[PDB]
Amino acid sequence: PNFSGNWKIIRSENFEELLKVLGVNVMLRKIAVAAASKYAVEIKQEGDTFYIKVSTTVYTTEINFKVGEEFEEQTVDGRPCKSLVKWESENKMVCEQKLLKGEGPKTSWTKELTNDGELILTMTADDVVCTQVFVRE
Ligand SMILES: *C/C=C(C)/C=C/C=C(C)/C=C/C1=C(C)CCCC1(C)C
């Protein structure tokens, strides 16, 4: 596997519906969907250590983790969480999240590198699955 790359989004499905489950009100959801049309993910992978930088027009966030080792990040709607990534196969990993404070929907995400060179991200909140597809710049 080599997830390393500068990835640009080409497709985004069910993102609005994901934000709805997470309690985001409709006007902000629409504005968020619009910001997702621009967004980029930069990955540097060495072995099972990942550096991931997610950026939109006005905001950028960095995620650092090692597979199998708990780390802290934030949920999609911004609530801090404890995360743990595991491989599910050669080119797919899955992250389970646990809220640091309080309660809410069960969230998770996955990243997969397809055989045709796409990166597929999924983000889940309860029953709702958002799928986003990226290609290398
Ligand atoms: C491993 C790759 C990951 C975990 C990517 C995570 C991406 C996000 C949490 C994106 C969030 C966004 C919003 C919360 C609203 C603005 C648009 C996005 C898609 C950047």
mmCIF file of C-alpha atoms and ligand atoms in Angstrom:
data_model
loop_
_atom_site.group_PDB
_atom_site.id
_atom_site.type_symbol
_atom_site.label_atom_id
_atom_site.label_comp_id
_atom_site.label_asym_id
_atom_site.label_seq_id
_atom_site.Cartn_x
_atom_site.Cartn_y
_atom_site.Cartn_z
ATOM 1 C CA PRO A 1 0.000 0.000 0.000
ATOM 2 C CA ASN A 2 1.015 3.571 -0.621
ATOM 3 C CA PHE A 3 -1.604 6.046 0.521
ATOM 4 C CA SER A 4 0.973 8.855 0.197
ATOM 5 C CA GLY A 5 -0.118 11.619 -2.138
ATOM 6 C CA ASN A 6 -1.923 14.895 -2.693
ATOM 7 C CA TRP A 7 -5.535 13.911 -3.164
ATOM 8 C CA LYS A 8 -8.281 16.104 -4.625
ATOM 9 C CA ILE A 9 -11.968 15.315 -4.226
ATOM 10 C CA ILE A 10 -13.940 14.288 -7.328
ATOM 11 C CA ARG A 11 -17.128 12.993 -5.728
ATOM 12 C CA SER A 12 -19.036 13.391 -2.477
ATOM 13 C CA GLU A 13 -22.203 11.522 -1.506
ATOM 14 C CA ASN A 14 -24.449 11.676 1.553
ATOM 15 C CA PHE A 15 -22.314 14.342 3.235
ATOM 16 C CA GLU A 16 -25.322 16.521 3.944
ATOM 17 C CA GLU A 17 -27.219 13.592 5.425
ATOM 18 C CA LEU A 18 -24.212 12.775 7.621
ATOM 19 C CA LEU A 19 -24.142 16.317 8.986
ATOM 20 C CA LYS A 20 -27.899 16.127 9.656
ATOM 21 C CA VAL A 21 -27.454 13.049 11.893
ATOM 22 C CA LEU A 22 -24.715 14.986 13.694
ATOM 23 C CA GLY A 23 -27.157 17.801 14.486
ATOM 24 C CA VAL A 24 -25.912 20.516 12.117
ATOM 25 C CA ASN A 25 -28.691 22.918 11.087
ATOM 26 C CA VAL A 26 -29.700 23.164 7.434
ATOM 27 C CA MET A 27 -28.031 26.444 6.411
ATOM 28 C CA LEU A 28 -24.650 25.356 7.804
ATOM 29 C CA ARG A 29 -25.076 21.942 6.195
ATOM 30 C CA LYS A 30 -25.496 23.544 2.770
ATOM 31 C CA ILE A 31 -22.461 25.757 3.340
ATOM 32 C CA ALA A 32 -20.439 22.737 4.472
ATOM 33 C CA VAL A 33 -21.384 20.709 1.393
ATOM 34 C CA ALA A 34 -20.184 23.630 -0.711
ATOM 35 C CA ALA A 35 -16.846 23.744 1.137
ATOM 36 C CA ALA A 36 -16.389 19.987 0.575
ATOM 37 C CA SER A 37 -16.344 20.513 -3.186
ATOM 38 C CA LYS A 38 -12.962 22.201 -2.933
ATOM 39 C CA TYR A 39 -11.316 20.042 -0.350
ATOM 40 C CA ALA A 40 -7.979 18.235 -0.388
ATOM 41 C CA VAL A 41 -6.284 15.510 1.626
ATOM 42 C CA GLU A 42 -2.519 15.194 1.810
ATOM 43 C CA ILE A 43 -1.159 11.904 3.097
ATOM 44 C CA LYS A 44 2.348 10.841 3.983
ATOM 45 C CA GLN A 45 2.636 7.156 4.830
ATOM 46 C CA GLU A 46 5.730 5.361 6.168
ATOM 47 C CA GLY A 47 4.970 1.772 7.189
ATOM 48 C CA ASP A 48 1.960 1.979 9.542
ATOM 49 C CA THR A 49 2.602 5.606 10.498
ATOM 50 C CA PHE A 50 0.358 8.150 8.774
ATOM 51 C CA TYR A 51 0.418 11.907 8.522
ATOM 52 C CA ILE A 52 -2.794 13.311 7.078
ATOM 53 C CA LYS A 53 -3.588 16.963 6.380
ATOM 54 C CA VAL A 54 -7.198 17.824 5.496
ATOM 55 C CA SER A 55 -7.810 21.284 4.016
ATOM 56 C CA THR A 56 -10.614 23.417 2.621
ATOM 57 C CA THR A 57 -10.466 27.029 1.454
ATOM 58 C CA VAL A 58 -10.155 28.582 4.938
ATOM 59 C CA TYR A 59 -9.355 25.687 7.279
ATOM 60 C CA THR A 60 -6.708 23.013 7.632
ATOM 61 C CA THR A 61 -6.319 20.164 10.152
ATOM 62 C CA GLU A 62 -3.551 17.593 10.632
ATOM 63 C CA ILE A 63 -4.080 14.002 11.773
ATOM 64 C CA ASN A 64 -1.139 11.890 12.953
ATOM 65 C CA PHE A 65 -1.464 8.247 13.919
ATOM 66 C CA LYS A 66 0.106 4.806 13.963
ATOM 67 C CA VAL A 67 -2.119 1.855 13.093
ATOM 68 C CA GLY A 68 -3.118 0.019 16.261
ATOM 69 C CA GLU A 69 -2.296 2.922 18.548
ATOM 70 C CA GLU A 70 -4.964 5.122 20.099
ATOM 71 C CA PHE A 71 -4.781 8.834 19.322
ATOM 72 C CA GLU A 72 -7.031 11.831 19.758
ATOM 73 C CA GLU A 73 -8.735 13.727 16.961
ATOM 74 C CA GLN A 74 -12.140 15.282 16.376
ATOM 75 C CA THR A 75 -15.375 13.904 14.947
ATOM 76 C CA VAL A 76 -16.704 15.357 11.680
ATOM 77 C CA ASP A 77 -18.946 17.847 13.498
ATOM 78 C CA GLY A 78 -15.990 18.882 15.664
ATOM 79 C CA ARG A 79 -16.406 16.926 18.936
ATOM 80 C CA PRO A 80 -13.073 15.652 20.355
ATOM 81 C CA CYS A 81 -12.740 11.856 20.350
ATOM 82 C CA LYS A 82 -10.382 8.941 20.968
ATOM 83 C CA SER A 83 -9.548 7.063 17.783
ATOM 84 C CA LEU A 84 -8.032 3.701 16.847
ATOM 85 C CA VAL A 85 -7.212 2.643 13.297
ATOM 86 C CA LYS A 86 -6.853 -0.974 12.166
ATOM 87 C CA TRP A 87 -6.204 -2.552 8.770
ATOM 88 C CA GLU A 88 -9.128 -4.412 7.243
ATOM 89 C CA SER A 89 -7.118 -5.597 4.228
ATOM 90 C CA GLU A 90 -4.013 -4.656 2.255
ATOM 91 C CA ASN A 91 -5.328 -1.279 1.148
ATOM 92 C CA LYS A 92 -8.178 -0.422 3.512
ATOM 93 C CA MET A 93 -8.139 0.835 7.086
ATOM 94 C CA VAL A 94 -10.955 1.521 9.512
ATOM 95 C CA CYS A 95 -11.087 3.946 12.411
ATOM 96 C CA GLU A 96 -13.419 3.643 15.373
ATOM 97 C CA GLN A 97 -14.060 6.742 17.458
ATOM 98 C CA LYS A 98 -15.128 7.214 21.079
ATOM 99 C CA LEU A 99 -16.336 10.565 22.439
ATOM 100 C CA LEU A 100 -14.065 12.171 25.035
ATOM 101 C CA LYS A 101 -17.022 13.939 26.656
ATOM 102 C CA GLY A 102 -20.728 13.169 26.562
ATOM 103 C CA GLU A 103 -22.856 11.190 24.130
ATOM 104 C CA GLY A 104 -23.835 11.139 20.466
ATOM 105 C CA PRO A 105 -24.124 8.998 17.317
ATOM 106 C CA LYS A 106 -21.624 6.181 16.743
ATOM 107 C CA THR A 107 -19.018 7.546 14.339
ATOM 108 C CA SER A 108 -16.214 6.006 12.317
ATOM 109 C CA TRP A 109 -14.277 6.397 9.120
ATOM 110 C CA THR A 110 -12.428 4.274 6.577
ATOM 111 C CA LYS A 111 -9.836 4.952 3.885
ATOM 112 C CA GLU A 112 -9.242 2.685 0.933
ATOM 113 C CA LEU A 113 -6.852 2.801 -2.004
ATOM 114 C CA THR A 114 -8.520 1.172 -5.036
ATOM 115 C CA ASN A 115 -6.713 -0.735 -7.792
ATOM 116 C CA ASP A 116 -7.503 2.097 -10.226
ATOM 117 C CA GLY A 117 -5.717 4.720 -8.110
ATOM 118 C CA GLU A 118 -8.652 6.324 -6.313
ATOM 119 C CA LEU A 119 -8.755 7.073 -2.597
ATOM 120 C CA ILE A 120 -12.104 6.329 -1.058
ATOM 121 C CA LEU A 121 -13.016 7.870 2.281
ATOM 122 C CA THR A 122 -16.127 6.863 4.128
ATOM 123 C CA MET A 123 -17.459 8.613 7.207
ATOM 124 C CA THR A 124 -20.290 7.066 9.168
ATOM 125 C CA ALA A 125 -22.702 8.320 11.788
ATOM 126 C CA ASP A 126 -25.058 5.588 12.961
ATOM 127 C CA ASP A 127 -26.897 4.291 9.895
ATOM 128 C CA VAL A 128 -25.719 7.068 7.574
ATOM 129 C CA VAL A 129 -22.655 6.547 5.400
ATOM 130 C CA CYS A 130 -20.917 9.361 3.526
ATOM 131 C CA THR A 131 -18.649 8.294 0.677
ATOM 132 C CA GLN A 132 -16.047 10.609 -0.827
ATOM 133 C CA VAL A 133 -13.750 9.811 -3.727
ATOM 134 C CA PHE A 134 -10.379 11.433 -4.492
ATOM 135 C CA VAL A 135 -7.749 11.277 -7.222
ATOM 136 C CA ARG A 136 -4.080 12.194 -7.067
ATOM 137 C CA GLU A 137 -3.153 15.717 -8.091
HETATM 138 C C1 LIG B 1 -8.519 9.899 7.023
HETATM 139 C C2 LIG B 1 -9.163 11.034 6.375
HETATM 140 C C3 LIG B 1 -10.059 11.694 7.117
HETATM 141 C C4 LIG B 1 -10.344 11.242 8.520
HETATM 142 C C5 LIG B 1 -10.780 12.850 6.573
HETATM 143 C C6 LIG B 1 -11.603 13.547 7.349
HETATM 144 C C7 LIG B 1 -12.287 14.676 6.726
HETATM 145 C C8 LIG B 1 -13.153 15.456 7.387
HETATM 146 C C9 LIG B 1 -13.469 15.220 8.836
HETATM 147 C C10 LIG B 1 -13.781 16.561 6.640
HETATM 148 C C11 LIG B 1 -14.626 17.434 7.190
HETATM 149 C C12 LIG B 1 -15.289 18.578 6.483
HETATM 150 C C13 LIG B 1 -16.170 19.278 7.219
HETATM 151 C C14 LIG B 1 -16.433 18.872 8.642
HETATM 152 C C15 LIG B 1 -16.936 20.462 6.685
HETATM 153 C C16 LIG B 1 -16.112 21.147 5.612
HETATM 154 C C17 LIG B 1 -15.795 20.136 4.530
HETATM 155 C C18 LIG B 1 -14.982 18.948 5.036
HETATM 156 C C19 LIG B 1 -15.338 17.802 4.087
HETATM 157 C C20 LIG B 1 -13.502 19.298 4.946
#
